[PDB]
Amino acid sequence: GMTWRRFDVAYHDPDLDRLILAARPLLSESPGRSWFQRHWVRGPHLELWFDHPEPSWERVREVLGTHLRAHPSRTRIDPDRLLPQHRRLALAEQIDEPLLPFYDDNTLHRAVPRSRVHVLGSAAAEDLFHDFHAAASTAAFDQLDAVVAGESRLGLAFELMIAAAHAHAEGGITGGFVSFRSHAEAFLAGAAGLRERWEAEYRTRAEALRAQVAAVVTGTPRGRAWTGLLDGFAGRGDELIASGALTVVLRSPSFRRYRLLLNLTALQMSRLGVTAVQRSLLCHFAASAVEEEYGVSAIEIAVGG
């Protein structure tokens, strides 16, 4: 917190995948824990977090300098309409920090790490997330090779969601149902007319989605890699929800674990460039595919008595 460095790479092109990829050597060079995330404070930007002195500002400035100059971002923005969205997002995410001015495109800034303690629960909670972000930043680089190499971004994300529910939900995949239906019903309560669209988008892909669910449930290299990564944080997470040092079958200790590991997965989806809408769509896709593939209703009714 007095050790963490943060660098903000201002970039208004929503596609960051190639920029992120350029920055990979920096994190490999870093002897400590390093990580990155997409963020919006003072406009779209990439954030590079390092808890050790190396690489170093001038290293960072030269690596990202090359790329930024070679591959600039031509995208404009609307500061006038964007500011209100952020001022709301600041209240939502609970973000005290200069929202103004906006960074100019294609600029490297040095910046102070923000604290997430008042949001996460403890200092211990904050450390756990740093650890996860570090591990998941590594795994993000691989997943983004694939994506730039043409692969489905949304398809990779769905895979992580399904794998996580199967490994870590009480009762495997059918036990992640409610959490999927939850995330998605939340979004649709906030915009009625999308319900029907979400339904039509599932319907044309129904058997295709189910086939992916089944495939991930059986086991895939990517699926086992992700759940493995999450493994590392399950034990430590338990303690912190047990001890009360981490954000609140409400009281259920093994429902709390899962909700956390599902949030970590969601953060991975941000990192990979899956927006709130796409994330809402995947959750709907997941809830419906799981329903139809396993007759989750038949089951809920069955265990009714």
Q: Report the distance separating Cα 232 and Cα 213, nearest Å.
A: 24
For residues 145 and 126, give the distance between their C-alpha atoms in angstroms, rounded to a whole number: 28
Which of 120, 162, 157, 165 has the alpha carbon at shortest distance from 271?
157
This structure's resolution (angstroms)? 2.5
Characterize the bridge pairing of strands 45-50 and 5-10: antiparallel
Q: How many CA atoms lie within 13 A of 305 on its CB side?
A: 0
At 15, the amino acid letter reads D
**Is the same domain home to 138 and 277?**
yes
On whether both 214 and 101 belong to a single domain, the answer is no
Q: Which of 300, 226, 294, 298 is nearest to 262 (CA)?
A: 226
Using alpha carbons, select from 272, 267, 273 the residue that is nearest to residue 131: 267
Residues 75, 141, single domain; the answer is no
Which of 303, 299, 283 lies closest to 165, judged by CA?
283
**Which residues, at least 6 apart from 195, have a Cβ–Cβ distance to it below 8 Å?**
188
Backbone angles phi, psi at 253, to 5 degrees: -65, -25
Residues 6 or more apart whose Cβ sits within 8 Å of residue 252: none
Strands 5-10 and 107-111, by their bridges, are: antiparallel
The half-sphere exposure of 285 on its side-chain side, counting CA atoms within 13 A, is 25
Please state, in angstroms and as integers, the Cα–Cα distance from residue 21 to each residue in 140, 143, 223, following that order. Answer: 10, 11, 22
| Contacts of residue 256, Cβ cutoff 8 Å, sequence gap at least 6 | 241, 248
Identify whether the C-beta of residue 136 lies closer than 8 Å to the C-beta of residue 260. Answer: no
Last residue of a domain, one of 71, 86, 111: 111
- Number of residues that make up the chain: 305
The residue to which tokens 């403890």 are assigned: 122
Tokens of 138: 């590594």
* 20 lies in the same domain as 163: no
**Location of structure tokens 């493995």:** 228
My answer on whether 290 and 156 are in the same domain is yes
19 and 139 part of one domain: no
Residues 227 and 136 in one domain: yes
Shared domain check, 161 and 274 = yes
HEC secondary structure over the chain: CCCCEEEEEECCCCCCHHHHHHCHHHHHHCCCCEEEEEECCCCCEEEEEECCCCCCHHHHHHHHHHHHHHCCCCCCCCHHHHHHHHHHHHHHHCCCCCCCCCCCCCEEEEECCCCCHHHHCCHHHHHHHHHHHHHHHHHHHHHHHHHHCCCCHHHHHHHHHHHHHHHHCCCCHHHHHHHHHHHHHHHHHCCCCHHHHHHHHHHCCHHHHHHHHHHHHHCCHHHHHHHHHHHHHHHHHHHHHHCCCCCCCCCCHHHHHHHHHHHHHHHHHHHCCCCHHHHHHHHHHHHHHHHHHHCHHHHHHHCCC
**Number of C-beta neighbours around residue 90 at 10 A:** 15
Query: Do residues 76 and 182 share a domain?
Result: no
Short-list 29, 108, 124, CA closest to 64:
108
Whether residues 178 and 97 fall in one domain: no
Pairwise CA distance, residues 12 & 204, whole Å: 33
Is residue 89 within 8 A of residue 95, CB to CB? The reply is yes
Domain count, the chain: 2
Q: Is residue 157 within 8 Å of residue 272, measured between CB atoms?
A: yes
- Final residue of a structural domain among 111, 127, 151: 111
Cα–Cα distance, 165 to 264 (Å, whole number):
12
Q: The domain containing residue 260 runs over which residues?
A: 117-302
Residue 246: C-alpha distances to residues 6, 33, 143, 191, 259 (Å): 24, 21, 29, 31, 12
Looking at the fold, whether 137 and 49 belong to one and the same domain comes out as no
Nearest in space to 16 (alpha carbons), one of 105, 132, 112, 100 = 105
Report d(CA 301, CA 293) in Å as an integer.
Answer: 16
Please enumerate in sequence order all residues whose Cβ is within 8 A of that of 197, keeping only pairs 6 or more positions apart, or say none.
Answer: none
Residue 137 and residue 277 share a domain: yes
The method recorded for this entry reads: X-ray
- Report the alpha-carbon distance of residue 64 to residue 55 in Å, rounded: 12
- In terms of phi and psi (left: phi > 0; alpha: psi -120 to 50; beta: otherwise), the region of 172 is left
**Residues whose CB falls within 8 Å of the CB of residue 59, separated by 6 or more in sequence, listed in order:** 26, 29
Rounded distance between C-alpha atoms, residue 180 and residue 258, angstroms: 12
* Residue type for position 230: L
State the virtual CA torsion across 5, 52, 10, 149 in degrees, nearest 10.
Answer: -150
